[PDB]
Amino acid sequence: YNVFPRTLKWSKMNLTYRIVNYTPDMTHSEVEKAFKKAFKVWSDVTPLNFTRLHDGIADIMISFGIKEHGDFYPFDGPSGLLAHAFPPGPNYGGDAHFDDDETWTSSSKGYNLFLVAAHEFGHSLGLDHSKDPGALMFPIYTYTGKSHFMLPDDDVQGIQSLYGPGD
């Protein structure tokens, strides 16, 4: 016999993702690089590994859409909800959707896709929102302006509570 797992986490360390479609705002390459960097944030502090697929069903299916886009979490035009993602699991679990009514950039203008992706992949991996305003998993986008990205300790603690450290 088997019982359902108690914790919403991935029970495998080698996970896949797929970019189902792309935003007008950035090149394919820029979008691909943003997501690769976002996943590296989490793999740097856990035993998790991430591979991109060009077809089929990946664990983490990534898409861009607006307003109603095929679930109970419709988008709302510029600002507000920037994106959403499902907790670990089969099917919809882990999937991440980005609001293409946002202006996506790789800078301090509009919303930084790497930054939002890093937050959403946190949800995809099992993290809910933090109550710490400085944490990456705080609900509200608050660009620091700082030169290089460093994952705040609250988010390291959170993710390592599910998966432990990389080594």
Ligand SMILES: COc1ccc(Cn2nnc(-c3cccc(C(=O)NCc4ccc(C(=O)O)cc4)c3)n2)cc1
């Ligand atoms: C929904 O999407 C959301 C995304 C983020 C938050 C909360 N949140 N807002 N900012 C930070 C947050 C947390 C920790 C650091 C920073 C930050 O700005 N670092 C500077 C930086 C950013 C991007 C790049 C790059 O592009 O290479 C380089 C450097 C931001 N966490 C909330 C929601």
Ligand SMILES: [Ca+2]
């Ligand atoms: Ca999935």
Ligand SMILES: [Ca+2]
């Ligand atoms: Ca929005």
Ligand SMILES: [Ca+2]
């Ligand atoms: Ca757009």
Ligand SMILES: [Zn+2]
């Ligand atoms: Zn959605």
Ligand SMILES: [Zn+2]
């Ligand atoms: Zn969130």
